Design a protein around this ligand. Structure first.
Ligand SMILES: Nc1nc2c(c(=O)[nH]1)N[C@H]1C(S)=C(S)[C@@H](COP(=O)(O)OP(=O)(O)OC[C@H]3O[C@@H](n4cnc5c(=O)[nH]c(N)nc54)[C@H](O)[C@@H]3O)O[C@H]1N2
Ligand SMILES: Nc1nc2c(c(=O)[nH]1)N[C@H]1C(S)=C(S)[C@@H](COP(=O)(O)OP(=O)(O)OC[C@H]3O[C@@H](n4cnc5c(=O)[nH]c(N)nc54)[C@H](O)[C@@H]3O)O[C@H]1N2
Ligand code: SF4
Ligand code: SF4
Ligand code: SF4
Ligand code: SF4
Ligand SMILES: [Cl-]
Ligand SMILES: [Cl-]
Ligand SMILES: [S]
Ligand SMILES: [W+6]
Lengths: 956, 214
């Protein structure tokens, strides 16, 4: 017996850091009644198999940490200290400030007289770190109070991915899952440092190599990832589209595409309208006045049924494939090598290694994150990779996919619960001011007259109605539709997002900010603008584990509390292992975790903080009245609580949804109150509620499928690592999306040794088939209007095909592919700042470091902010390895330890050496001592530009 | 009867093992500063039983050979540290018959710790400047006796860390050296008949660390 664990209760949990979703085992003193005594990995968990990176490994020290908040704190306007206070004080006083600001600012109708029922004097930040039930309840609270300025992490992380992959495949999510990486024949990691930033992924990447895969790292820096790859290939920052363009030309020139896949499953055969053209860097329909495009000019030529025309022979010169061949002929190896600064030899090696997966019985995968998403390219960059993956027949197959690596543990789930300004839960758009009725809202959904296009989004009316029923069960959906706030139709959609919220804040056009599980005083670009801007708030609600640079902006560097009139409430939430609920991993796996210890001190789950806060707003409205109270009074919170606290279970069941009455649907009979078994049984008529149609099938009458921990697998499932009885993923336990494309028209896999689905005795066997129907009867991309993987994407702002427009303004003066230098849809480049700053992560720290700067073992490994430079820039500026350096820019300056390393090398741009300097953004002024402040003192706020910004570096 | 096989051709220098050593034994963190390396702590100490050493080596073309060395007592089949301390006070250093673990006891405060370190051809032993106790990796002998993997092994996600019966671990090292040599032609096993922690290096062990091998 191990004494340490002998008298402790053992529970399972899920890592609270990155989106791999590692399994934990927690040991709690006094058989549950005390503090946590131990946290290590869950050896039965099929993702990590007991392994933890140092973030997961150190979760004991995160939880049992004497620096953690114990009770609410109050900061008085112009005050220079905190005063500890009661929950009941801070919540009631908070509930007041909400009602005050709302009643004062609430607008029933915009300038144009359209119903909107909203307030623009309160904004909310966060959070990808709360449980899925907390995210869903949080969103619905903010929307009953009529907020529209609702945002989190997701907008900087992966806001390019969702539209790029939705354009390409019809869904925004990572296409495969972590275990499936082991099935790849070639793994390309580009715009990702997965060995440091998704470490347990490397379990499966290295198992892929064991089975004969080539691993390829394409990065401007040599990293811990590069050290364990077969091919390291340097690429200068922002040259990715030239790189992926060459690969597209390489695949066509050499006839390495999967022809049958391309013919049948992509839009290769669709005929584009004669209005489509491209010349000297501009597609047709361009308007030079507005710096904007007329996408109608790109539409497909339609048959007399409304259905896009098709030449299955692929002969017609307006075939997508023929237009694509023509567009990418300009991307030859000499131009591509020149601009990427990657040798011709290395480009040839990578192209050959990756295009070899064009073979039916070979699969290649791309892994990317912020190296792609935080450049200006970003969307067209991800479009290029998707197009390559469709050319090679890599989408729907084991070891294939686009593996868009999500960041935070529940950023997938926070996104799914609509914690962005443009989406409700389930990705139903926030109605705009011109959507004056639910009928109009539903009329905006595109239709298809193609009998083979499933076109699943046509079921939207059932989801939106079921949603409105979940919030407002005693109202008709058409009536409930007037409670929720709307955005202006006449307005730039980005005017509601992160970057603009900070611009609005700095013009004092907000009274209140919720900083809920986010640290913007370190996270947002141009920290100095933001730290000032937060002073122009009247009140601030910060909900976090520890006091931080956000809660305490008012006593930060060069700030005088006396000057600063902002009233701050600090509410201490509990850690992941102190509460129950679900987090959704990058693979879409929705995983249940349990309470180990009771909340430290007087900390509360976020679900209790926000529910109680809303109860104090509700009764404040019920006693005093005020602005349009019905949406607050009418909201069904009864279904969210049990024994006087937030109920994760109950909230989860409401998200899945249940029949509000005795109902017949899809020719089955259902009893009132019965749990909804799948989104296929939701109705538009109010028979059914569901907080999120994606969650329908997650908590059925069968039980909580998210809490399953069953490793049962058929031979075919176990061959590729589906683990369908471990937890649950949306939609309806489809582990690999678009898997209908993994088989021919008879239902036989392209690669029988690695089948995802197979047609056997009149049924699909293996994964859950992504869309019902017999083999050869349905187009495989069911969320697409037309049913196809889009090579040609006529709904994308920058044009239907990715095109290289120079992301780097300052050091690049000419484009080798056109006469359009920059993106045809302001950086000063002051010569005092001659080097290219970039920010990025290390394995040991997390985000702004709020969490990891408070764990002694993580600071031990990585105690201070560093600046990585080449020997060339070291020799030039006379900097020695370990010297203190000042890094500066138009926005700010800071101090950092020099790491001189051959792992950085200067870019060769237009004849001249360009030096790139690297900083981590894991540092802030609060803690630890000599740690340093954020790298975002240096970055500009012009989804912002954090992977390339002009600095100088000097020895102190 | 137990051996670690440590395949350094699989290490991501994620430093799971380093953190997981401390979490399991509830060791404290050192005062550290960055002196121009990711490496930290810079060396083994009375409170650090394992650190990951980083070495950057030049190579022709893009990139570097970045050598990662997660250092621990090798649990020698013939402990020189015992031999040294056994002639000052026998019992201060012990060998577990069961596991093969070499263990430093509370009685190491009553020897020439300093000279027990010198006997160590791997420069592993470390001294408490107060109690004069000697500390080092104890093989998680606790957990092994209970039939748990050692913390540093269970935590490692890459397949670098491996543990079990000598026969099975030697067999595996043999077989894995053969496959790894296909990618890293100069791959060798560290002192594979002398020790119970058998490192696979991708090249000259001395590039990973001065005291990598005897
Ligand atoms: N340890 C740790 N892990 C994390 C996080 C963390 O803070 N710490 N954060 C999580 C979050 S929220 C996210 S979004 C992900 C992000 O995960 P990553 O995307 O891996 O994040 P970074 O390390 O910022 O950048 C990845 C790589 O992109 C490279 N890069 C920079 N510019 C370019 C370019 O133009 N082209 C190419 N091809 N590469 C370029 C950088 O050199 C770097 O090696 O990580 C998640 N995981
Ligand atoms: N220069 C630069 N800036 C960047 C980036 C970059 O690469 N470079 N990355 C950008 C990206 S991709 C992102 S996502 C943002 C992220 O930036 P933020 O999200 O603003 O950063 P953190 O606050 O560290 O994110 C995790 C937070 O979750 C909190 N948390 C953990 N558990 C809980 C819980 O149960 N409840 C609550 N309420 N909070 C909890 C932690 O205390 C911590 O504050 O930063 C962006 N900023
Ligand atoms: S941070 Fe990511 S890789 Fe590391 S233990 Fe947690 S989930 Fe696993
Ligand atoms: S075997 Fe145990 S004591 Fe030795 S280094 Fe690993 S975790 Fe630390
Ligand atoms: S490595 Fe050194 S301290 Fe460890 S058993 Fe061998 S001689 Fe003893
Ligand atoms: S945990 Fe494994 S992969 Fe990570 S540094 Fe330690 S040995 Fe290397
Ligand atoms: Cl969008
Ligand atoms: Cl597998
Ligand atoms: S994220
Ligand atoms: W992110």
């Amino acid at each position: 017996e191990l004494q340490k664990l002998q008298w402790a209760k053992q529970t399972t949990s899920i890592c609270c850091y990155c989106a791999v979703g590692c399994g934990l085992i927690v040991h709690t003193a006094k058989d549950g009644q005390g503090r946590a005594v131990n946290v290590e990995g869950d050896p039965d968990h099929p993702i990590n198999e007991g392994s933890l990176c140092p973030k997961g490994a150190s979760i004991f020290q995160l939880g049992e940490n004497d620096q953690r908040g114990t009770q609410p704190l109050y900061r008085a306007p112009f005050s220079d200290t905190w005063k500890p206070v009661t929950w009941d004080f801070a919540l009631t006083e908070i509930a007041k400030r909400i009602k005050k600001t709302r009643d004062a600012s609430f607008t029933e109708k915009n300038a144009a007289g359209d119903l909107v029922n909203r307030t623009e004097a309160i904004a909310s930040f966060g959070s990808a770190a709360m449980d899925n039930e907390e995210c869903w309840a949080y969103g619905n609270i903010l929307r009953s109070l009529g907020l529209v300025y609702i945002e989190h992490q997701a907008r900087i992380x992966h806001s390019p991915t969702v539209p790029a992959l939705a354009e390409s495949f019809g869904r925004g999510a990572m296409t495969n899952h972590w275990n499936d990486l082991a099935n790849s024949d070639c793994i390309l990691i580009m715009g990702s440092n997965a060995a440091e930033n998704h470490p347990i992924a490397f379990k499966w990447v290295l198992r892929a190599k064991d089975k004969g895969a080539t691993l390829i790292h394409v990065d401007p820096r040599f990293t811990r990832t590069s050290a364990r790859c077969d091919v390291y290939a340097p690429i200068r920052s922002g040259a990715d589209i030239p790189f992926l363009g060459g690969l597209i030309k390489y695949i066509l020139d050499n006839k390495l595409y999967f022809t049958d896949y391309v013919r049948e499953y992509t839009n290769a055969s669709l005929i584009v309208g004669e209005k489509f053209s491209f010349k000297d860097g501009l597609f047709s329909g361009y308007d030079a006045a507005n710096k904007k495009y007329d996408k109608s000019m790109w539409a497909f030529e339609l048959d007399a049924n409304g259905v896009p025309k098709r030449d299955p022979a692929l002969k017609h010169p307006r075939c997508v494939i023929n237009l694509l061949k023509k567009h990418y002929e300009r991307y030859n190896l000499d131009k591509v090598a020149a601009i990427t600064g990657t040798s011709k030899e290395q480009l040839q090696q990578v192209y050959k290694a990756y295009a070899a997966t064009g073979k039916p019985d070979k699969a290649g995968t791309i892994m990317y994150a912020a190296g792609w998403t935080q450049h200006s390219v970003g969307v067209q960059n991800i479009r290029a990779m998707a197009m390559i993956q469709l050319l090679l027949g890599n989408i729907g197959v084991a070891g294939g996919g686009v593996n868009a690596l999500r960041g935070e543990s529940n950023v997938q789930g926070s996104t799914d619960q609509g914690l962005l300004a443009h989406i409700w839960p389930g990705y139903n758009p926030v109605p705009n001011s011109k959507a004056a009725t639910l009928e109009l809202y539903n009329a905006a959904t595109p239709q298809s007259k193609d009998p083979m296009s499933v076109n699943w989004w046509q079921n939207r009316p059932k989801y939106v109605a079921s949603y409105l029923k979940a919030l407002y069960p005693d109202e008709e959906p058409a009536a409930a539709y007037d409670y929720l706030p709307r955005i202006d139709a006449g307005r730039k959609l980005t005017d509601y997002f992160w970057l603009n919220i900070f611009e609005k804040m700095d013009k004092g056009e907000f009274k209140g900010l919720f900083a809920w599980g986010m640290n913007p005083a370190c996270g947002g670009a141009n920290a100095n603008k933001n730290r000032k801007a937060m002073g122009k708030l009247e009140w601030l609600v910060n909900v976090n584990l520890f006091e931080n640079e956000t809660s305490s902006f008012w006593k930060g560097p060069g700030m005088n509390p006396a000057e600063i009139g902002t009233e701050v409430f600090f509410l201490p939430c509990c850690v992941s292992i102190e509460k129950e609920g679900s987090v959704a991993n990058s693979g879409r796996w929705m995983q249940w975790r349990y309470r180990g210890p009771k909340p430290y001190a007087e900390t509360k789950p976020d679900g209790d903080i926000m529910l109680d806060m809303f109860k104090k707003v509700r009764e404040l409205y019920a006693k005093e009245g005020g602005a349009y109270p019905a949406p607050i009074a009418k909201l069904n919170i009864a279904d969210w609580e049990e024994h006087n606290e937030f109920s994760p279970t109950k909230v989860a069941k409401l998200m899945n949804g249940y029949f509000l009455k005795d109902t017949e649907v899809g020719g089955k009979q259902f009893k009132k109150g019965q749990q909804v078994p799948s989104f296929a049984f939701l109705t538009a008529d109010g028979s059914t509620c569901s907080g999120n149609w994606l969650h329908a099938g997650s908590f059925t009458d069968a039980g909580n499928l998210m809490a399953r921990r069953d490793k049962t697998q058929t031979p075919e499932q176990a061959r590729i690592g589906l683990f369908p009885n471990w937890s649950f993923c949306w939609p309806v336990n489809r582990r690999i999306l678009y898997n209908r494309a993994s088989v021919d028209k008879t239902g036989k896999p392209w690669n029988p040794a690695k089948a995802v689905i197979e047609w056997k005795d009149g049924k699909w066997v293996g994964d859950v088939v992504d869309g019902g129907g017999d083999p050869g009867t349905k187009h495989p991309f069911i969320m697409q209007t037309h049913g196809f993987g889009a090579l040609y994407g006529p709904g994308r702002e920058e044009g239907p095909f990715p095109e290289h427009y120079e992301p780097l303004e300052c050091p690049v003066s000419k484009n080798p592919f056109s006469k359009q230098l920059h993106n045809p849809v302001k950086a000063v480049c002051d010569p005092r700042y001659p080097f290219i700053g970039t920010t990025y992560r290390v394995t040991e720290h997390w985000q702004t470091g709020l969490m990891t700067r408070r764990c002694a073992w993580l600071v031990e490994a990585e105690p201070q902010i560093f600046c990585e430079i080449s020997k060339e820039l070291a020799k030039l500026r006379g900097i020695g390895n370990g010297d203190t350096v000042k890094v500066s820019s138009l926005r700010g300056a800071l101090e950092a330890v020099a790491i001189v390393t051959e792992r950085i090398r200067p870019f060769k741009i237009e004849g001249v050496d360009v030096h790139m300097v690297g900083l981590p953004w894991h540092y802030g002024w609060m803690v630890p001592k000599n740690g340093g402040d954020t790298a975002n003192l240096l970055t500009p706020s012009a989804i912002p530009e954090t992977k390339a910004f002009m600095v100088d570096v000097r020895k102190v | 009867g137990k051996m670690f096989f440590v395949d350094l051709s699989r290490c991501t220098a994620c430093r799971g093992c380093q953190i997981a050593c401390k979490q399991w034994k509830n060791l404290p963190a050192e005062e550290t500063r960055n002196t121009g390396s990711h490496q930290n702590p810079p060396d083994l100490s009375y409170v650090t039983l394992k650190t990951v050493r980083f070495t950057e080596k030049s190579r022709k073309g893009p990139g570097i050979d970045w050598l990662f060395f997660p250092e621990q007592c090798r649990h020698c089949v013939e402990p020189p540290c015992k031999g040294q301390a056994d002639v000052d006070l026998e019992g201060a250093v012990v060998k577990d018959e069961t596991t093969g673990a070499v263990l430093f006891t509370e009685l190491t405060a009553k020897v020439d710790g300093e000279s027990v370190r010198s006997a160590c051809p791997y420069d592993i032993p470390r001294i408490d400047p107060v109690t004069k106790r000697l500390s080092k990796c104890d093989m998680c002998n606790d957990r092994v006796q209970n039939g748990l993997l050692p913390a540093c092994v269970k935590t490692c996600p890459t397949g670098t860390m491996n543990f079990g019966d000598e026969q099975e671990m030697l067999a595996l090292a043999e077989k894995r050296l053969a496959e790894v040599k296909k990618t890293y032609p100069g791959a060798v096993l560290g002192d594979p008949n002398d020790v119970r922690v058998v490192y696979l290096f991708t090249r000259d062990p001395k590039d990973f660390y001065e005291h990598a091998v005897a």
